[PDB]
């Protein structure tokens, strides 16, 4: 019934009606010592409904993430279960359908992540031993599990040891790997007529090509260099390989296996050409030809987009090498290239126009960059940039030749051939932009072309056109302004606000969106208002203009990010409008809570909200709080993990701002002590901010500190969460009354030092140091001495001498240095018993005071900048780059005044010759 029980909840969770009930009943079930295995056996049962297994598979993936390992890499599951799961999972994933196999690939990737190499010795043996010659389907399996683990090298950067883990793997897979590839190649030539058999064979080749990459993404192992001719040989072969059996001319949008094998094969070649050009040298030309004849026989069909890309990434990698460039360097291979490769793949194809009308925002993501860089205009552009950096004048000219024609052709019948104006607006642009088009715009441009002129002559006209050939053009025009803003006159730009703001009142999805985007950029510049009031109102209007449905509503993230940035410009200009705005923002939140889609959107909505509150006046903060609380409480009652991080931050902000905790927020305090809430990896920064506020604003809300120090203990023990530890403690000790802390102080002291003795981190030690300077100034040196001396007798002497003195001058962060330094100085010159009880330490702490003084010569997604608390408490009067040294000097002088020429003279001889000299410099300075 363990299995039957899970089976039941998975099934119930699939019923929209019993999802919250199910999810909760599943969480409860999660606590059991076998839940993981149960879930797996379920997924593994063939007789169950895909829907249920998928649900099970899916849940498993998420379970793993939150339960498999804590912050610090520790298995939160019992050894037995853990070892069992890793044994079960590999064979399970090797047998599942792609849909579920993929879900498990992620589970397994996460598992491999913290345990792959050390805590999973059998993995490589087990995988290798499952490769055979007759069982291809099974091979693909084993191979997939493989690639999903090694995948994770590609983004990494070289390391003294990465090579070691790779060697660890390579040694095991090298032979059978090449052996299977040889086998696969032979088997393919023999099955030339078995659709079913080919397909399968090519499903194995695909993963081999992908693993081949995995093994060569850091270096070329001796085994692949010495044995390259065989590999590239095979790939050189399937790149040209064709087969009726692996075609489907009726297919227009979805790539085949044959095509995928050719795309990912083109991705290897590009890796070799970029990373081992000489070791690869020979073969580069053989490839340049096939890639060319391949690019010339492809249709403008979606089905090939990725292959056209990946193959252009290879040509572009080639053009970088002077030797090969010379073959495009003649004046006709430029002309050919244009006519053969670029012009065809860059022309607006019919299927695009359909997208521009049928899925406007998808079109919008393909014309703008950030994600989904797979395409043809991008590969082409990146290629063209490589060509024009070699012979600016060569390329620029032949293209100019072609465009001049595309212009005349447009002139003849604007209505019939506008696609030509799109075409050169593209080309000119692609030839004009000189570098990597940053957010800042465009760092430079091709001199042989004049962006402004081209603009006044052909980009502007299209913005005012009575009737236009086609909308896409006005869009292209806006995109032009957007792209070249840096190159246009600031007045030239402002002259465009009026007309741009016109498009925000158009039903043309793309236009006003682009419109928005461009006004946002333009206003941000005029920065370093009645206009804005009107603008927000129009921008918000456009956010509802498509309906209130959760999925569709959160669709346009560009509009919401723009609203945010308009608010980011008009700080406190529009205080009277906030409430209505806030009320609408919350209104969007409420709708979205129903089905949180598009995280980007979710984010900017909170940032906007975040902003409004940041600029509202404290006295008028309340009304705002009463309009969001009801909406937020419901966020909690139904744990909407997509919004919680944001709400915490905001409410946290709200509290830090009030002089008292608003009664509609007080009930949050206690439930916020529940350990459950502190076991959610990505919400910690945000929650310790909330706890932190309640404490600052009103400690009385926590009648029993015990559970609080409960959290402190949880954090301060976690290498991963030390920073959160201290942050919380600063508040605890400097903001709660002593007579109310007097009984936990011994405990704090002990935990603070247990992490010192048996678990330190460079980060930790300095933080301790600053924390000590922090207490020395605030609670007093005597306080501090008594503080650590509680743990054991004499400990102050040992810790001050070996950890604080020595670290002080190591501290790099300026603010943390100031605090620590003034904190330490503060013990020499304001310490009642230090100077007399600890003789040893005076010269020592003195030395470092003088050295240090002289020195001068994934939770981020849910991090609201708008409210970001980037200004951490500090002693204001001192300047982190000037003043700290004068303070010391001054503080010291004012201290000899009390004993008149006594102190400084007694020390000097005990200071180091170096410091003695530094002290003279310092005093006089
Ligand atoms: Mg004392």
DSSP states of 387-448: HHHHHHHHHHHHHHHHHHHHHHHHHH-TTT--HHHHHHHHHHHHHHB-S---TT--S-B-TT
Neighbouring residues of 375: CB distance < 8 A, sequence distance ≥ 6: 305, 309, 366
* CA 625 to ligand 1 centroid distance, Å: 46
* CA 773 to ligand 1 centroid distance, Å: 17
Interatomic CA distance for residues 535 and 563, integer angstroms: 9
Q: Are 84 and 37 in contact (CB under 8 A)?
A: yes
* Residue 483, phi then psi, degrees to nearest 5: -70, -50
User: Mapping DSSP to helix (H, G, I), strand (E, B) and coil, where does residue 254 land?
Assistant: coil
Burial group, residue 275, by CB count within 10 angstroms (0-12, 13-18, 19+): middle
- Cα–Cα–Cα angle for 480, 485, 490, rounded to 5 degrees: 135
Q: Are 184 and 205 in contact (CB under 8 A)?
A: yes
* CA 57 to ligand 1 centroid distance, Å: 61
Q: Are 502 and 535 in contact (CB under 8 A)?
A: no
* CA 830 to ligand 1 centroid distance, Å: 13
* CA 713 to ligand 1 centroid distance, Å: 26
* CA 786 to ligand 1 centroid distance, Å: 6
User: Mapping DSSP to helix (H, G, I), strand (E, B) and coil, where does residue 882 land?
Assistant: strand
- Cα–Cα–Cα angle for 749, 734, 862, rounded to 5 degrees: 95
Among candidate residues 465, 476, 569, 545, the one with its CA nearest the CA of residue 514: 476
Q: How far is residue 857 from each of residues 141, 204, 572, 912, measured CA to CA in Å?
A: 61, 62, 41, 19
Count of structural domains, the chain = 1
* CA 149 to ligand 1 centroid distance, Å: 58
* CA 831 to ligand 1 centroid distance, Å: 10
* CA 827 to ligand 1 centroid distance, Å: 13
User: Mapping DSSP to helix (H, G, I), strand (E, B) and coil, where does residue 643 land?
Assistant: coil
- Number of other residues whose CB lies within 10 A of the CB of residue 484: 21
Interatomic CA distance for residues 354 and 356, integer angstroms: 5
Among candidate residues 531, 536, 530, the one with its CA nearest the CA of residue 516: 536
- Both tokens assigned to 112: 């491999």
Interatomic CA distance for residues 827 and 823, integer angstroms: 7
* CA 785 to ligand 1 centroid distance, Å: 7
Ramachandran bin of 150, using left for φ above 0, alpha for ψ from -120 to 50, beta for the remaining angles: alpha
DSSP string, 549-564: -HHHHT--HHHHHHHH
Residue 825: CA atoms inside 13 Å, Cβ hemisphere, count? 24
* Residue 667, phi then psi, degrees to nearest 5: -60, -15
What residue has token string 């709708």? 591
* CA 780 to ligand 1 centroid distance, Å: 10
Interatomic CA distance for residues 609 and 865, integer angstroms: 11
Burial group, residue 74, by CB count within 10 angstroms (0-12, 13-18, 19+): exposed
Q: How far is residue 867 from each of residues 575, 607, 661, 897, measured CA to CA in Å?
A: 17, 8, 18, 46
* CA 751 to ligand 1 centroid distance, Å: 22
* CA 803 to ligand 1 centroid distance, Å: 21
* CA 732 to ligand 1 centroid distance, Å: 21
* CA 809 to ligand 1 centroid distance, Å: 27
Ion ligand 1, residues whose Cβ is below 5 A away? 782
* CA 783 to ligand 1 centroid distance, Å: 7
* CA 793 to ligand 1 centroid distance, Å: 13
Q: Are 42 and 87 in contact (CB under 8 A)?
A: no
* CA 504 to ligand 1 centroid distance, Å: 70
What residue has token string 């030309």? 285
* CA 671 to ligand 1 centroid distance, Å: 38
* CA 591 to ligand 1 centroid distance, Å: 59
* CA 724 to ligand 1 centroid distance, Å: 30
Interatomic CA distance for residues 414 and 470, integer angstroms: 9
Q: Are 331 and 391 in contact (CB under 8 A)?
A: no
Among candidate residues 498, 491, 485, 433, the one with its CA nearest the CA of residue 459: 485
Among candidate residues 151, 141, 149, the one with its CA nearest the CA of residue 101: 141
What secondary structure letter does DSSP report for 120?
Answer: -
* CA 819 to ligand 1 centroid distance, Å: 22
Strand partners, 433: 445
Q: Are 326 and 370 in contact (CB under 8 A)?
A: no
Residue 571: CA atoms inside 13 Å, Cβ hemisphere, count? 10
Interatomic CA distance for residues 427 and 832, integer angstroms: 77
Rounded to a whole number of angstroms, the distance between the first and last alpha carbons of the chain is 80
Neighbouring residues of 516: CB distance < 8 A, sequence distance ≥ 6: 504, 539, 542, 558, 559, 562
Strand partners, 883: 879
The alpha helices in 31-95, defined as continuous H runs, are 35-44, 50-67, 79-95
* Residue 329, phi then psi, degrees to nearest 5: -65, -25
Residue 868: CA atoms inside 13 Å, Cβ hemisphere, count? 10
- Number of other residues whose CB lies within 10 A of the CB of residue 341: 23
* CA 784 to ligand 1 centroid distance, Å: 9
* CA 303 to ligand 1 centroid distance, Å: 79
- Both tokens assigned to 450: 């004049």
Helix (H) or strand (E) holding 567: helix 557-567
Ramachandran bin of 572, using left for φ above 0, alpha for ψ from -120 to 50, beta for the remaining angles: left
* CA 450 to ligand 1 centroid distance, Å: 77
Q: Are 579 and 623 in contact (CB under 8 A)?
A: yes
Residues 244, 248, 252, 255, CA torsion sign? negative
Q: Are 174 and 124 in contact (CB under 8 A)?
A: no
* CA 298 to ligand 1 centroid distance, Å: 85
Among candidate residues 718, 713, 676, 672, the one with its CA nearest the CA of residue 693: 672
- Both tokens assigned to 532: 């804005």
Q: Are 223 and 174 in contact (CB under 8 A)?
A: yes
- Both tokens assigned to 161: 């040891």
Domain membership of residue 801 as a residue range:
1-925
- Both tokens assigned to 399: 């293209």
* CA 841 to ligand 1 centroid distance, Å: 17
User: Mapping DSSP to helix (H, G, I), strand (E, B) and coil, where does residue 879 land?
Assistant: strand
User: Mapping DSSP to helix (H, G, I), strand (E, B) and coil, where does residue 48 land?
Assistant: coil
* CA 759 to ligand 1 centroid distance, Å: 29
Strand partners, 445: 433
Q: How far is residue 286 from each of residues 298, 378, 694, measured CA to CA in Å?
A: 19, 25, 69
Residues 619, 623, 626, 628, CA torsion sign? negative
**Crossing angle (nearest 10°) for helices 98-115 and 136-150:** 40
* CA 32 to ligand 1 centroid distance, Å: 51
The widest CA-to-CA distance across the chain, in whole angstroms, is 103
Neighbouring residues of 397: CB distance < 8 A, sequence distance ≥ 6: none
What secondary structure letter does DSSP report for 359?
Answer: S
Interatomic CA distance for residues 303 and 881, integer angstroms: 59
Interatomic CA distance for residues 820 and 896, integer angstroms: 22
User: Mapping DSSP to helix (H, G, I), strand (E, B) and coil, where does residue 875 land?
Assistant: coil
Q: Are 127 and 83 in contact (CB under 8 A)?
A: no
* CA 782 to ligand 1 centroid distance, Å: 5
Among candidate residues 488, 423, 421, the one with its CA nearest the CA of residue 450: 488
Neighbouring residues of 539: CB distance < 8 A, sequence distance ≥ 6: 504, 516, 559, 562, 563, 566
| Per-residue burial over 878-910, b = 16 or more CB atoms within 10 Å of its CB, e = otherwise | beeeeebbebbbebbeeeeeeeeeebbeebeee
* Residue 326, phi then psi, degrees to nearest 5: -45, -25
* CA 771 to ligand 1 centroid distance, Å: 19
């Amino acid at each position: 019934s363990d299995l039957e029980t899970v089976a039941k909840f998975l099934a119930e969770s699939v019923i929209a009606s019993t999802a919250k009930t199910s999810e909760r009943n599943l969480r409860q079930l999660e606590t059991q010592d076998g839940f993981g295995l149960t879930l797996l056996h379920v997924i593994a049962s063939t007789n169950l409904p895909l829907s249920t297994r998928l649900a099970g598979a899916l849940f498993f993936k998420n379970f793993i993430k939150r339960k498999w390992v804590d912050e610090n890499g520790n298995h939160l599951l019992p050894a037995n279960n853990v070892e069992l799961i890793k044994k079960e999972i590999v064979p399970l994933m090797i047998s599942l359908p792609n849909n579920l196999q993929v879900q498990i690939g992620e589970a397994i990737s996460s598992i491999a992540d913290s345990d792959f190499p050390d805590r999973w010795p059998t993995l490589l043996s087990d995988l290798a031993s499952r490769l055979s010659n007759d069982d291809m389907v099974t091979n693909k399996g084993v191979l997939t599990v493989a690639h999903s683990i090694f995948k994770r090298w590609r983004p990494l950067f070289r390391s003294d040891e990465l090579f070691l883990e790779i060697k660890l793997v390579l040694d095991v897979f090298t032979a059978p790997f090449l052996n299977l590839l040889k086998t696969v190649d032979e088997q393919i030539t023999a099955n030339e007529n078995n659709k079913a058999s080919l397909n399968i064979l090519f499903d194995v080749l695909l993963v081999l090509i992908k693993l081949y990459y995995d093994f060569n993404c850091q270096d070329i192992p001796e085994f692949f260099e010495d044995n390259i001719q065989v590999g590239m040989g095979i790939f050189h072969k399937y790149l040209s390989y064709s087969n009726p059996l692996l075609e489907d001319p009726d297919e227009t949008e979805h790539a085949s296996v044959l095509i995928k094998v050719k795309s990912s094969i083109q991705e290897l070649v590009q890796l070799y050409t970029t990373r081992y050009e000489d070791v690869f040298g020979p073969m580069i030309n053989e490839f340049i030809q096939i890639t060319w004849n391949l690019l010339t026989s492809i249709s403008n069909q979606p089905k090939y987009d990725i292959l056209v890309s990946k193959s252009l990434s290879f040509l572009t990698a080639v053009t970088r090498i002077p030797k090969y460039f010379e073959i495009f360097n003649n004046e006709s291979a430029m002309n050919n290239i244009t006519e053969q490769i670029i012009l065809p793949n860059v022309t607006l194809r019919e299927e695009d126009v359909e997208l521009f009308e049928d899925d406007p925002i998808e079109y919008i993501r393909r014309d703008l960059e950030g994600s989904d860089t797979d395409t043809r205009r991008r590969a082409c552009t990146d290629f063209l940039k490589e060509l024009k950096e070699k012979n600016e004048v060569l390329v620029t000219n032949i293209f100019l030749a072609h465009m001049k024609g595309f212009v005349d052709q447009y002139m003849s019948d604007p209505s019939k051939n506008w696609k030509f104006k799109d075409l050169y607006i593209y080309l000119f642009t692609a030839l004009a932009i000189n570098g990597n088009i940053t957010n800042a715009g465009v760092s430079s441009t091709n001199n042989l072309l004049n962006v402004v002129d081209f603009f006044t002559k052909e980009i502007a006209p299209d913005l005012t056109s009575n009737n236009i050939p086609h909308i896409i053009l006005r869009v292209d025009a806006i995109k032009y302004i957007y792209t070249f803003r840096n190159q246009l006159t600031k007045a030239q730009l402002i002259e465009l606000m009026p007309i741009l703001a016109t498009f925000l009142q158009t039903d043309e999805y793309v236009v006003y969106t682009y419109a928005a985007i461009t006004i946002e950029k333009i206003l941000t510049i005029r920065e370093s208002s009645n206009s804005t009031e009107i603008l927000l109102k129009n921008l918000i209007a456009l956010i509802l203009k498509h309906g209130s449905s959760p999925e569709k509503l959160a669709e346009n993230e560009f509009l919401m990010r723009s609203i945010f940035r308009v608010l980011q410009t008009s700080e406190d200009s529009i205080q009277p409008l906030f409430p209505q705005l806030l009320a609408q923002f919350i209104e969007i939140v409420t709708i979205m809570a129903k089905n949180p889609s598009n995280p980007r959107f979710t984010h900017y909505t909170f940032e906007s909200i975040g902003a409004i509150l940041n600029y509202t006046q404290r006295q008028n903060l309340p009304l705002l709080v009463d309009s969001m609380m009801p909406t937020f409480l419901t966020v909690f009652s139904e744990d909407i993990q997509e919004f919680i991080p944001y709400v915490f931050q905001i409410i946290a902000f709200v509290v830090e701002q009030s002089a008292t905790i608003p009664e509609s927020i007080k009930p949050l305090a206690q439930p916020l002590l529940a350990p459950n809430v502190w076991e959610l990896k990505g919400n910690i920064p945000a929650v310790t901010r909330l706890l932190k506020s309640f404490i600052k604003t009103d400690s009385s809300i926590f009648p029993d500190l015990v559970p609080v120090l409960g959290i402190f203990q949880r954090l301060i023990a976690s290498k991963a969460y030390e920073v959160h530890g201290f942050d919380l403690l600063e508040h605890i000790m400097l903001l709660i009354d002593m007579n109310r802390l007097r009984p936990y102080i011994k405990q704090i002291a002990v935990l603070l030092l247990q992490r010192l003795q048996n678990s330190k981190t460079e980060r930790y030690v300095k933080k301790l140091t600053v924390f000590f300077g922090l207490i020395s100034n605030k609670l007093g040196s005597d306080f501090l001495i008594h503080f650590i001396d509680e743990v054991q007798d004499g400990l102050f002497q040992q810790i001050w001498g070996n950890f604080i003195i020595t670290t002080l001058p190591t501290i790099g962060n300026l603010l943390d240095r100031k605090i620590a330094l003034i904190g330490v100085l503060n013990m020499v010159i304001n310490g009642q018993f230090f100077q007399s009880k600890y003789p040893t330490l005076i010269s020592s702490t003195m030395n470092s005071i003088i050295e240090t003084a002289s020195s001068q010569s994934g939770s981020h997604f849910s991090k609201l900048v708008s409210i970001s608390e980037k200004p951490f408490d500090p002693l204001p009067e001192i300047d982190v780059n000037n003043g700290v040294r004068l303070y010391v000097a001054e503080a010291l002088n004012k201290y000899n005044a009390i004993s008149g020429n006594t102190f400084l003279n007694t020390i000097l001889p005990q200071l180091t010759q170096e410091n003695q000299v530094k002290l003279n410099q310092l005093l006089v300075g």
